[PDB]
Amino acid sequence: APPVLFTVQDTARVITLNRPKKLNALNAEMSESMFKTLNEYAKSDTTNLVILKSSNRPRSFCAGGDVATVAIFNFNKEFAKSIKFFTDEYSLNFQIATYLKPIVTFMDGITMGGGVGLSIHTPFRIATENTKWAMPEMDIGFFPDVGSTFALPRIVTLANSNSQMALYLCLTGEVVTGADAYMLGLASHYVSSENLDALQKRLGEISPPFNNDPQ
Amino acid sequence: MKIQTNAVNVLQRTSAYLKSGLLKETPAWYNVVASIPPSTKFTREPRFKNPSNGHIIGKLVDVTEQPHANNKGLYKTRPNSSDKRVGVKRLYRPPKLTYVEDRLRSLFYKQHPWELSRPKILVENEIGDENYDWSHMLQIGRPLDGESVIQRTMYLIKTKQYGDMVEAYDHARYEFYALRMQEETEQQVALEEAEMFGSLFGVSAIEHGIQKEQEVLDVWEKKVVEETELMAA
Amino acid sequence: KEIPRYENRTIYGDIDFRYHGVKLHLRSAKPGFGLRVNHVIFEICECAGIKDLSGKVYKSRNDMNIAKGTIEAFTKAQKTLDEVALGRGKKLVDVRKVYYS
Amino acid sequence: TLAELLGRSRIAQVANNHKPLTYTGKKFHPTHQIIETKPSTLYRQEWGLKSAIPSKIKSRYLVYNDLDTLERITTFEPRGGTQWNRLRFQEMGVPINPFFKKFNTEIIGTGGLSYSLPGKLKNSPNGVIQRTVVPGRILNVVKWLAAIGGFVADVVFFQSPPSSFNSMGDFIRMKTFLFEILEASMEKNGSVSMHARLL
Amino acid sequence: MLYELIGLVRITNSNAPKLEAKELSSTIGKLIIQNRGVVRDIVPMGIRYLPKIMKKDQEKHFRAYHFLMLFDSSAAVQSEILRTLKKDPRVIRSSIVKVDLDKQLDRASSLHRSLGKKSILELVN
Amino acid sequence: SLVKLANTCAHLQNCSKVRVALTSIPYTKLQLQFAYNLYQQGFLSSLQKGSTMGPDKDFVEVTPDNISTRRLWVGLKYRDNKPVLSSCKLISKPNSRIHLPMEDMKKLCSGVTIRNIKPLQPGELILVRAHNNIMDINEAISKKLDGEVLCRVK
Amino acid sequence: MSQPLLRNRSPEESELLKLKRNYNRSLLNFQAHKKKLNELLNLYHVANEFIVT
Amino acid sequence: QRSLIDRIQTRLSELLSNDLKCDQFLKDHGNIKKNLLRKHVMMDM
RNA sequence: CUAGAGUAGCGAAACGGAUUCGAUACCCGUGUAGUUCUAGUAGUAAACUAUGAAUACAAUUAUUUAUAAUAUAUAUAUAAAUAAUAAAUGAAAAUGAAAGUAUUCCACCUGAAGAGUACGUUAGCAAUAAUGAAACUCAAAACAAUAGACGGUUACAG
RNA sequence: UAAGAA
Ligand SMILES: [Mg+2]
Ligand SMILES: [Mg+2]
Ligand SMILES: [Mg+2]
Ligand SMILES: [Mg+2]
Ligand SMILES: [Mg+2]
Ligand SMILES: [Mg+2]
Ligand SMILES: [Mg+2]
Ligand SMILES: [Mg+2]
Ligand SMILES: [Mg+2]
Ligand SMILES: [Mg+2]
Numbered sequence A: 001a002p003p004v005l006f007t008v009q010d011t012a013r014v015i016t017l018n019r020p021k022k023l024n025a026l027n028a029e030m031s032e033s034m035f036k037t038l039n040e041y042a043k044s045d046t047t048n049l050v051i052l053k054s055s056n057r058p059r060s061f062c063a064g065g066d067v068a069t070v071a072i073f074n075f076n077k078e079f080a081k082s083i084k085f086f087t088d089e090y091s092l093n094f095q096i097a098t099y100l101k102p103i104v105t106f107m108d109g110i111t112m113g114g115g116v117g118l119s120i121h122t123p124f125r126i127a128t129e130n131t132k133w134a135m136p137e138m139d140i141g142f143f144p145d146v147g148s149t150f151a152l153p154r155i156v157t158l159a160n161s162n163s164q165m166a167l168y169l170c171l172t173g174e175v176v177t178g179a180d181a182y183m184l185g186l187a188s189h190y191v192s193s194e195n196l197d198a199l200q201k202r203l204g205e206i207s208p209p210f211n212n213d214p215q
Numbered sequence B: 001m002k003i004q005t006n007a008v009n010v011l012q013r014t015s016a017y018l019k020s021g022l023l024k025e026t027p028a029w030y031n032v033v034a035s036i037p038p039s040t041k042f043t044r045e046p047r048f049k050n051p052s053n054g055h056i057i058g059k060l061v062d063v064t065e066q067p068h069a070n071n072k073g074l075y076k077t078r079p080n081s082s083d084k085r086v087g088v089k090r091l092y093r094p095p096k097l098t099y100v101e102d103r104l105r106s107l108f109y110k111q112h113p114w115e116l117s118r119p120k121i122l123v124e125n126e127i128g129d130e131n132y133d134w135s136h137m138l139q140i141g142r143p144l145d146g147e148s149v150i151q152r153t154m155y156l157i158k159t160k161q162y163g164d165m166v167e168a169y170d171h172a173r174y175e176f177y178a179l180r181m182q183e184e185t186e187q188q189v190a191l192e193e194a195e196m197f198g199s200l201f202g203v204s205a206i207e208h209g210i211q212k213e214q215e216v217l218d219v220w221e222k223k224v225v226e227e228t229e230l231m232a233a
Numbered sequence C: 001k002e003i004p005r006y007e008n009r010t011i012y013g014d015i016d017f018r019y020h021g022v023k024l025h026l027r028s029a030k031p032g033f034g035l036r037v038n039h040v041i042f043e044i045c046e047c048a049g050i051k052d053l054s055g056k057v058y059k060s061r062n063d064m065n066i067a068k069g070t071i072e073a074f075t076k077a078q079k080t081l082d083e084v085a086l087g088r089g090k091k092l093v094d095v096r097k098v099y100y101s
Numbered sequence D: 001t002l003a004e005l006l007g008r009s010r011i012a013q014v015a016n017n018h019k020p021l022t023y024t025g026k027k028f029h030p031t032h033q034i035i036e037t038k039p040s041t042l043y044r045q046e047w048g049l050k051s052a053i054p055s056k057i058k059s060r061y062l063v064y065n066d067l068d069t070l071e072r073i074t075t076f077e078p079r080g081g082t083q084w085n086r087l088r089f090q091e092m093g094v095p096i097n098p099f100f101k102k103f104n105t106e107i108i109g110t111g112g113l114s115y116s117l118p119g120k121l122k123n124s125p126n127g128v129i130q131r132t133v134v135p136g137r138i139l140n141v142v143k144w145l146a147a148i149g150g151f152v153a154d155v156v157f158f159q160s161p162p163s164s165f166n167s168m169g170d171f172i173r174m175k176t177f178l179f180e181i182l183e184a185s186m187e188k189n190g191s192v193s194m195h196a197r198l199l
Numbered sequence E: 001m002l003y004e005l006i007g008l009v010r011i012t013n014s015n016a017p018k019l020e021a022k023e024l025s026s027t028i029g030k031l032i033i034q035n036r037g038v039v040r041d042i043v044p045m046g047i048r049y050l051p052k053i054m055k056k057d058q059e060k061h062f063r064a065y066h067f068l069m070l071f072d073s074s075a076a077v078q079s080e081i082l083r084t085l086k087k088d089p090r091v092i093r094s095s096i097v098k099v100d101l102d103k104q105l106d107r108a109s110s111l112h113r114s115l116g117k118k119s120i121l122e123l124v125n
Numbered sequence F: 001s002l003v004k005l006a007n008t009c010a011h012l013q014n015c016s017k018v019r020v021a022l023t024s025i026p027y028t029k030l031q032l033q034f035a036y037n038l039y040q041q042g043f044l045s046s047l048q049k050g051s052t053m054g055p056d057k058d059f060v061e062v063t064p065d066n067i068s069t070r071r072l073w074v075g076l077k078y079r080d081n082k083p084v085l086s087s088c089k090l091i092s093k094p095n096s097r098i099h100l101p102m103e104d105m106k107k108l109c110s111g112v113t114i115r116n117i118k119p120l121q122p123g124e125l126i127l128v129r130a131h132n133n134i135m136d137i138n139e140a141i142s143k144k145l146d147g148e149v150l151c152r153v154k
Numbered sequence G: 001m002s003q004p005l006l007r008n009r010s011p012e013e014s015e016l017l018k019l020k021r022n023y024n025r026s027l028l029n030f031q032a033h034k035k036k037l038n039e040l041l042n043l044y045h046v047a048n049e050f051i052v053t
Numbered sequence H: 001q002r003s004l005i006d007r008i009q010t011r012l013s014e015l016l017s018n019d020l021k022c023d024q025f026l027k028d029h030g031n032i033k034k035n036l037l038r039k040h041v042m043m044d045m
Numbered sequence I: 001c002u003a004g005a006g007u008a009g010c011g012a013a014a015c016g017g018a019u020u021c022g023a024u025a026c027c028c029g030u031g032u033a034g035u036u037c038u039a040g041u042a043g044u045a046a047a048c049u050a051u052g053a054a055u056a057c058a059a060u061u062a063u064u065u066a067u068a069a070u071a072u073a074u075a076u077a078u079a080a081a082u083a084a085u086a087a088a089u090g091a092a093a094a095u096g097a098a099a100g101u102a103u104u105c106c107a108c109c110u111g112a113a114g115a116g117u118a119c120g121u122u123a124g125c126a127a128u129a130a131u132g133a134a135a136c137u138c139a140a141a142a143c144a145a146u147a148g149a150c151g152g153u154u155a156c157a158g
Numbered sequence J: 001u002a003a004g005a006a
Helices: A028-043 A067-075 A079-097 A114-120 A148-155 A164-172 A178-183 A193-205 B010-020 B030-035 B088-092 B100-111 B113-117 B146-158 B165-195 B205-232 C039-048 C063-076 C081-088 C095-099 D002-008 D039-043 D082-092 D163-174 E018-034 E075-086 E110-115 E120-124 F002-018 F029-040 F102-109 F137-142 G011-049 H002-017 H019-028 H032-044
Strands: A004-009 A012-017 A049-054 A060-063 A103-107 A110-112 A124-127 A132-134 C014-019 C022-028 C053-059 D061-066 D075-077 D133-140 D144-148 D151-156 D177-186 D192-198 E002-009 E038-041 E044-049 E063-072 E091-093 E096-099 F022-026 F044-051 F070-076 F088-090 F125-130 F133-136 F147-153
Touching: A004 A028, A004 A193, A004 F044, A012 A028, A012 A193, A028 A079, A049 A060, A049 A193, A060 A103, A060 A114, A067 A079, A079 A114, A103 A114, A110 A114, A114 A148, A124 A178, A148 A164, B010 B030, B088 F022, B100 B113, B100 B146, B100 B165, B113 D082, B146 B165, B165 D082, B205 D082, B205 D133, B205 D163, C014 C063, C022 C063, C039 C053, C039 C063, D082 D151, D082 D177, D133 D151, D133 D163, D133 D192, D144 D177, D144 D192, D151 D177, E002 E018, E002 E075, E018 E038, E018 E063, E018 E075, E075 E096, E120 G011, F002 F022, F002 F029, F002 F070, F002 F088, F002 F147, F022 F029, F029 F044, F029 F070, F029 F125, F029 F133, F102 F125, F102 F137, F102 F147, F125 F137, F133 F137, G011 H002, G011 H032, H002 H019, H002 H032, H019 H032
Parallel strands: A012 A049, A049 A103, A060 A110, A103 A124, A110 A132, D151 D192
Antiparallel strands: A004 A012, C014 C022, C022 C053, D061 D075, D133 D144, D133 D177, D144 D151, D177 D192, E002 E063, E002 E091, E002 E096, E038 E063, E044 E063, F022 F070, F044 F070, F088 F147, F125 F133, F125 F147
16 A cells, blocks of 8 residues: 555645555655645645544654665765755755644654654644654654754753753664653644544534635 | 524624624623634444443454464355444444453342442542552451452452462462451451440341331232221121 | 525526426527516516526426526526535636627 | 543443342342442432432432433432341341352352451440340241341240230330341352341 | 044943943944044043934933044045944044144043143153 | 445535534445545545444445445535535435436536426535446536536535 | 456356255255154154044 | 365455565465465365 | 026115105115126226335334244344334325335326217227327316314313 | 516
């Protein structure tokens, strides 16, 4: 099946990451499809908001980027493919950050690397009891890649006057779970998993009251 | 009753009034309702799992998934007439909630009918405030009754200290008896010790029953005499 | 009530509406087309701002029932282009509106 | 989840039963769980059931079958009598062991009527109580039958009835007697058979 | 086919009332067995007063010896047996009812089946 | 089979009147193509394969062993207290099959009543069968393909 | 949409299916015969009490 | 008959479970692999 | 109705007695045909659910009814029927799983009256049954419901 | 490009 599924909920558009075995690891195919489809939705006048979720709902939302292929694209010296991969991923992150319609991310499960990039750049990011949030790039010889260095110095609530809690999270790669992520500001809302279905229906129903401007 | 339209669209009709000019002033609720839309679907929604016991609703087992002879020795080689009937109604019927404890609640009170005479309060205090460790039966904030026995039984089962529900239930029963005997001895000895120090009680339970029986029996005597006299005439 | 109107002159599509014994068949019309309808419907259209309309009444031609049923036809048996577009998640384009820019 | 809490809720703790609330046969033991309310909740018709109980009910005890019915009422009786029998038995002091070391539905030992163990003496300001004295009511001319503390018991005489018995006749139940409860066993049906003697 | 006959034989010989019923049973049984039949039971009911003063042919009865006979025979001979019963002065009332054998080859009479003994095998254990 | 398609149209209307979110239709190539055209056109919220008991959670492969117990499960859409799929009717009936050429199809899409068929409405979908492919009428016009005018859905 | 609607039953599946169906029929016939012989035997026990002569 | 059916099914399930020895048997006897495996198992007994 | 049997009761017709202004009626008495059986003819009824058959589908409740379980209890599941309904339909009364949503096939209707008449034909022992006109006349005629009036209409009170 | 009335 396609690695990303696109569906409709009466006004919202649902984007489901659809790679269960690899824990929704993000690719260049996935990033390109998401980027182009979000570009389409940005023009549609019948779209009000986008929901980002995963089919592998409990275990993972997005367990990082699929940087193993990036590492094989560099063992075989195919550096152009790694460049395309990161261009797609980071252009997608830039799109999500600057999107003019609401984007709602369901961080139900593991949320790491590319997952944080998908979820951290939206004002509406929902953690659950299953949210396992982390930024584990220091141990694979890589850097915070998805705009985390821009977001975390700004969104984190506690002990972040000079980005020092952001630095702690980035450098240590500590796994922040559930309501701790909500309390630190890594998530904007905290909703139980059992409710995310009903919420998804509600987000599909609400429309701007009049003059139909969802922006 | 027909699904009503005019209760959930008060905003739209009000806005038509306002745009036309039929209504001059915006109501106080207008912006509030505009910012908080009502739910206006009113659909029937299917369900695919029984909440209580975890049974899956809406799965058909295929003949390929029954490759072994049934209890009568016959293989299943084609669907039966039940499998061929659309079972969409089950998806919408509110499922019956089931708990093994209820089978075990019925047993206890069949074995102890006089435990039904112990009054029970169904008014909840706060279900969220309960923090019980069912490694023991007595709990602070709870009475000792059949539910203590059954919760202890379920605890013993989920920790696999017993494999069979019967043995766990019997163990809980004997702990319950141990606690009940202590309570009754406490009551009796407390009364005895109270009398030995000059506690003067008024009416006891026996005298209470005697006086109520007397109150009833006076009226009964009067009615009997009146009826006999009437019958004689 | 508020009556949906396409271009503030006609009804959006066609309407085949039964109100008790009255069968109304209303059809949207082009600009400049008049109100070619039953006289009761003509008066209602004059009050409602419908300018272009064709239609026919069958079975009962009781004036009161025609009058009452045409209003349910206008309010209940019409869906605007916006409602259809949002319900289906599709874009409904009016070809004549776009031909003239 | 909501289902687990419902399984643990107080309504769920009451075992299902549909035995008639107006039984006119023989009563050997309770059939219905007695439901109690505090004065504060009774003032607001609150009993922990679905629906508010009518204000006519001033008693704080009831028994019930169905929370709600097609008749839009709760099937209940404002009675908690069987608790007063049990307590009265506890006042008598006469004891009645399976309480000591697939499913069997038979009553186990005493069915919760009494947990008192057999051999113990009741100290009193006079001294050790040798025998238990209890008020009662002779019922009918027959071992006679006596209503004692909510239980029907067998009366045996020292030598013969006194003149009051045949003087009163069927009104013998109007006057209170004193009895010695000799013993109290329980039979297979669940019925307690106390043996007493008039004094 | 299994059939259950319930005859009401007359008892004119007061000193030995069973005398008639014995020879009735002998005649009917001889007919059955000589016509490729079988007799499974000859259960005797007792002497009993009839509900009314029943008049077979031109003689009135107030009591009779009741008897039951369970026998396996064909339809033609069963009709023949009924014919002989109906034109016999000794017999006051007669009735032959089928006992269906679609389930069990062995089946007890109506009396034993009512008592609880469904088949003759139970009745002999 | 036009009889089964008519049954499906009536069943969809029935399910929209009571506002059930999910229902089932017979499992056939025509039924699947029709449901897919409705789904792509925005009239259905979801289309799944399944059994007589419910939609399949995971892929279940269809064989003669289970063909009689297969169904197609469709999710119906509602918005603003109105069903998205209100009416669904056949044009080509079993007892009067209507095959049109591309020119008459263009006339029908342009407001002309052809063979007593009312023309296409502003928010309506007319489906056409060509070479055992169901498809939107405007798409058939674009592909210059004559065909059997099958059903309206509004 | 790409998946075939129906997949034909392979000759091996057909052979196993025919095996199972033949067994089902044979088993039902055999059980009928067994109960038949049992009922015959239970009549053969009580046949002592049947008059034939 | 019963023994043949039950043995065929048990052998089929076992081979489909541990998928190395089924490859061993496929190269010993010569998603289609499932049907061919069933063919070989059915001729096997 | 045709033959042949039977005919106790009931009972067209008929004959009488009443009642009545009158009785050609209701009521009473005798009572033939018929009602019964056998072999036929005939093929009509408010032959009615005033509702053709089949198929797919649509929200509930309560009863039974019949199976299948599970240990009287599961207020047990799956079917049919019945009752009250939602929606839908309908001129409404109301229908309600059809008078709803659909599909297929058949029968039938097209103002009242003349008229289910005449004529013809076919069939039948007959009675009749089927098929089934037109001229003439009129602006009528009918259905549901509404409010009254009335009833040799009910019940309750005063 | 389909109007009704007494
Ligand atoms: Mg004659
Ligand atoms: Mg006669
Ligand atoms: Mg007469
Ligand atoms: Mg008259
Ligand atoms: Mg006369
Ligand atoms: Mg004939
Ligand atoms: Mg006639
Ligand atoms: Mg007729
Ligand atoms: Mg009608
Ligand atoms: Mg005629």
